[PDB]
Amino acid sequence: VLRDNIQGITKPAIRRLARRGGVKRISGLIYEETRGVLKVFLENVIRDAVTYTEHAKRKTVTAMDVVYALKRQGRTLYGFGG
Amino acid sequence: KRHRKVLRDNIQGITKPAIRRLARRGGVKRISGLIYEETRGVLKVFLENVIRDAVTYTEHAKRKTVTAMDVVYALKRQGRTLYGFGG
Amino acid sequence: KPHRYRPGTVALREIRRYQKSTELLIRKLPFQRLVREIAQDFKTDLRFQSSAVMALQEACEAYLVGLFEDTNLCAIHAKRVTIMPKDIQLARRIRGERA
Amino acid sequence: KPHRYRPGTVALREIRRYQKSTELLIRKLPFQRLVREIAQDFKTDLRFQSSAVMALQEACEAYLVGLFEDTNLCAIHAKRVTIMPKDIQLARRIRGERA
Amino acid sequence: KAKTRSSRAGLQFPVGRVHRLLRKGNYSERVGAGAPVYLAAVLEYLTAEILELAGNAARDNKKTRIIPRHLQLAIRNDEELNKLLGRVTIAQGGVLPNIQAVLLPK
Amino acid sequence: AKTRSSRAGLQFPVGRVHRLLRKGNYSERVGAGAPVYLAAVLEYLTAEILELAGNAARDNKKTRIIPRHLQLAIRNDEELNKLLGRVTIAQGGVLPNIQAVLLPK
Amino acid sequence: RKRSRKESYSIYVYKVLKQVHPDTGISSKAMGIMNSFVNDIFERIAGEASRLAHYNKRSTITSREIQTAVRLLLPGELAKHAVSEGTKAVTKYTSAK
Amino acid sequence: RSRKESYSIYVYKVLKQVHPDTGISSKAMGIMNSFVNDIFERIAGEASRLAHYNKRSTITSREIQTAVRLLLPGELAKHAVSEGTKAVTKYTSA
DNA sequence: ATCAATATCCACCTGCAGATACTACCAAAAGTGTATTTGGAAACTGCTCCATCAAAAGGCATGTTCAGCTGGAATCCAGCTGAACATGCCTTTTGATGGAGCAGTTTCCAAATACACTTTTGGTAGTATCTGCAGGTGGATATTGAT
DNA sequence: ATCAATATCCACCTGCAGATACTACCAAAAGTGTATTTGGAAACTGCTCCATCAAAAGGCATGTTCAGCTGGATTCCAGCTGAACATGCCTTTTGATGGAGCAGTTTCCAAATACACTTTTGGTAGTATCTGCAGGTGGATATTGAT
Ligand SMILES: [Mn+2]
Ligand SMILES: [Mn+2]
Ligand SMILES: [Mn+2]
Ligand SMILES: [Mn+2]
Ligand SMILES: [Mn+2]
Ligand SMILES: [Mn+2]
Ligand SMILES: [Mn+2]
Ligand SMILES: [Mn+2]
Ligand SMILES: [Mn+2]
Ligand SMILES: [Mn+2]
Ligand SMILES: [Mn+2]
Ligand SMILES: [Mn+2]
Ligand SMILES: [Mn+2]
Ligand SMILES: [Mn+2]
């Protein structure tokens, strides 16, 4: 069956995320709203990561590329180098 | 030979109409009575944190005079960058 | 028969007035006393450049104005038109100032 | 009559379950598809370290979970217990991620 | 006759000074000759962008002298300058006129 | 030959902290005291977290500190939580917390 | 005693103002803002370029580092034009002497 | 092939000093490494700006101290300052 | 819709704060030229680890039904909060003075850089042994929701 | 209150992935010793500007009265979203397998640094003189609210 990739981020997985966030009841429109927010996040972080990749003249996005990008965006991540 | 009078309770110099005006510039139409004391508390926390950092810069330079730059540097590191007084 | 504007009319007039201008809204000398009192509690015998106090007032007024904006959105979100302390608290929590 | 839990009971059970654990909650492969698709828009024929993709999923899931907490506070602020796009939007606005 | 590196680059902004500030700033051990040129050009371009928009705001306010208010109007009304300076306070700049619709009478 | 760490009473590498400082382009010069002080501050902060994380491991009846324990240690400590407020710990999860109004009855 | 020289970007900001708005002036407080702006953006780009060079074990900040820093730091159209203006200035600079 | 430095074995040393019978997983060790690197960068960075603000070319223990006061919350700052002063004292004497 | 009270607009003007203009001065800055050093690009390549492939295995996502209960709409009203007024206080303004302390310049040594050399160490690679605990079991018992 | 249906917890067990303990190897890195350089503390002091003074006055804070309309409580009900169950679809596992490309090594030259010398310039500093617009007035237009 034909399938968009962002639609691969399924309703039940979004549900579990909300539950860890302490959310008890979810509106039907939340699931499309969440996917849109997810996409912007990834776009912003991946754009910065790939930019580090290009500068290093590589073809492989490294964990460090991602880590540096997250730090830029004020989303510092522990556990993957640096 | 002298010393200045004791400084106390100056937070009340932040008057209700002064707080009303700031709310207006912030687009606020209607204000509950408990807002004014809440605002004074919030302002005091903000001012303390910036002054603490500014004075820290002052002492490190071995000065007794807090400069505009001390404040600007303090604001910069608190994530409140300010244009118009500085370097 | 003496004239009275309805509750809300003058408030809206005031919003338009102060969103149009740029001057400081807190009285100058009282703010200066507040700064000296707070600074003194941290360190005695400090002096202030006049521009240093003004920098603090510009920062404080810009901070509060911005906070009232976020506060207003929280109140409207609750289908109110009147800002309340719980609105300020919600805004500061989401801002990460208390979280 | 067959057994049936009241609405909300199982929801609360899930909250306790996932707040206790740390495993990722999005399927690995669909997430990996999404990452490569988005990356392809910035540069073609890219490869990824496995740790790179995992770093992305960790940061992204931690972000959405944090956002949902702030969203929940907004819903409760409006005296609801159901989160709505209205709530996500307010949280992101106040966070400074937009508007 | 000597030529400035600025004139050699076709720039109004000072290349020599920018080069000095890079070395004096402890950003790296070495600084290439192309680096201050590129940086001076970017700084100059951004300055031109803001002054353009601020000059317009001044004009719309029937003024010929740009004041901080005009700089603020130009920045907050431009989506990209607003993003770039989103965590910046312009002293004596005030705010944009903006009243939430639900607050208006009806 | 006695290492500067030994000479200062530290487990953390003073010589390395010094090399990292001057190769980091933080300044033209580095005083001899600076890497000692900094190495000391880093060791102490490491000790404070490992202490609290160890206790978290004990409470869960474990003897090996895992990421989850580091998270519990940090988020349950007012000052460590503030210092690391914009940091996310991989595989750390969140604190158990349910808003009161969501509880039944 | 002569008070030490306080450098600013004023005379350059003023030049660009005249190119852009020939009949428009600028107050000293506004010029103060402009000076804060240039110094801020200088520091952001330089700082980002510094990190960039350090991540890649390079001891030299070249025009290449500045460009990537500008792409990382500026949004959309601003990055596009800034990069263009910067490239243009470098090629012209090197095509001389 | 080349080598990659980390704080791992120093982290482990400090671990056995405070919890002799406690171990630490490699994933958790990665986090501690990130932590030490992060705080190093923060403190060094702030000390750098301090020195520059005051037209100084040297970063001394004085810059490190003021940086720590600026960066760490109340009690953490107090103890860190104490630990720092203690170590520089015992380094002068020894 | 009419009309009256009041805010709002805009033209016109005047005083002056602040911007513009000029000359003189000059220390630092910027450029030029020569000699010397070396960062890192280029080309080749070995070895890591990434992409893909098959291929069950089944765990988990999807579609459906049903109804519990939440969201939102409607209604009411006590009292909070805005508008307006009278009163008069304290902030603002203008200007002067003394001197605290910031800052400019010069002298001078403790400490830091720069090499050369020696020694220690931390990262490493195999190689083999060890163990904390995830995951599975049973059965006790707590919770939930029907009566 | 009883009582049935699940969920949840505790005690124990066992395989193994990941922690560990070991020996050996070595390049880099840290320690040592010596000669050289220099940053910035001291001392001294010129001079900006901060604290404090007085005095007059009107902009604005305070405090009160009055009632408009907002917030909060209550009720009510349509329909949305949770729970449960039945499918079956594709994520997961892992294991092997090219080979892309990260990364290590060698070569070497364009470009950077160091340095001495010459010239240009941007920043006070001292006065001297325009000029944009703030703020005042007056009178025409617009807005708001009662009726
Ligand atoms: Mn006090
Ligand atoms: Mn070389
Ligand atoms: Mn029904
Ligand atoms: Mn309800
Ligand atoms: Mn009064
Ligand atoms: Mn004195
Ligand atoms: Mn060893
Ligand atoms: Mn278990
Ligand atoms: Mn010197
Ligand atoms: Mn009434
Ligand atoms: Mn209402
Ligand atoms: Mn190849
Ligand atoms: Mn000149
Ligand atoms: Mn006017």
Residue numbers in the entry:
A (entry chain B): 21 to 102
B (entry chain F): 16 to 102
C (entry chain E), D (entry chain A): 37 to 135
E (entry chain C): 13 to 118
F (entry chain G): 14 to 118
G (entry chain D): 29 to 125
H (entry chain H): 31 to 124
Can you provide the manuscript's text about this entry?
The nucleosome core particle (NCP) is formed by wrapping the histone octamer, comprising two copies of the four core histones H2A, H2B, H3 and H4, with the superhelices of a 145–147 bp DNA duplex. In contrast, the N-terminal tails of the core histones, which are rich in positively-charged lysine and arginine residues, protrude through the DNA superhelices. Furthermore, the N-terminal tail of H4 is crucial for the compact folding into chromatin fibers.
We analyzed the biochemical characteristics of the reconstituted H4-acetylated NCPs, and solved the crystal structure of the H4-K5/K8/K12/K16-tetra-acetylated NCP at 2.4 Å resolution, for comparison with the unmodified NCP. The structure of the NCP with the K5/K8/K12/K16-tetra-acetylated H4 is fundamentally the same as that of the unmodified NCP. The main chains from V21 to I26 and the side chains from R23 to I26 are visible in one of the H4 molecules (molecule B) of the H4-tetra-acetylated NCP. In particular, the position of R23 in molecule F and its hydrogen bonds to E56 of H2A and E110 of H2B, in the acidic patch of the neighboring NCP, are conserved between the H4-tetra-acetylated and unmodified NCPs. The H4 tetra-acetylation significantly increases the B-factors of the outward DNAs in 7–8 SHLs, particularly around SHLs –1.5 and +5.5. Thus, it is unambiguously concluded that intra- and inter-nucleosomal interactions exist between the DNA and residues 1–16 or 1–20 of the H4 tail, which are disordered in the crystal structures, and that the tetra-acetylation of the tail impairs these interactions.
